[PDB]
Design a protein around this ligand. Structure first.
Ligand SMILES: *[C@@H]1O[C@H](CO)[C@@H](O)[C@H](O)[C@H]1O[C@H]1C[C@](C)(N)[C@H](O)[C@H](C)O1
Ligand SMILES: *[C@@H]1O[C@H](CO)[C@@H](O)[C@H](O)[C@H]1O[C@H]1C[C@](C)(N)[C@H](O)[C@H](C)O1
Ligand SMILES: [Cl-]
Ligand SMILES: [Cl-]
Ligand SMILES: [Cl-]
Lengths: 7, 7
């Protein structure tokens, strides 16, 4: 993970 | 805004 979003 | 991140 480590990313974010939101999709 | 309204979206997220983190870039
Ligand atoms: C997403 O990350 C930001 C930056 O640290 C935090 O401020 C935020 O609380 C965090 O969002 C939580 C709530 C969410 C979106 N329902 C998910 O549970 C994420 C993984 O964590
Ligand atoms: C979104 O990220 C910023 C920067 O890290 C935080 O300061 C903010 O608290 C976080 O927003 C919260 C609250 C919100 C907008 N209702 C959402 O749950 C997000 C994911 O987390
Ligand atoms: Cl998402
Ligand atoms: Cl949320
Ligand atoms: Cl960002």
């Amino acid at each position: 993970x480590x990313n974010x979003x939101y999709x």
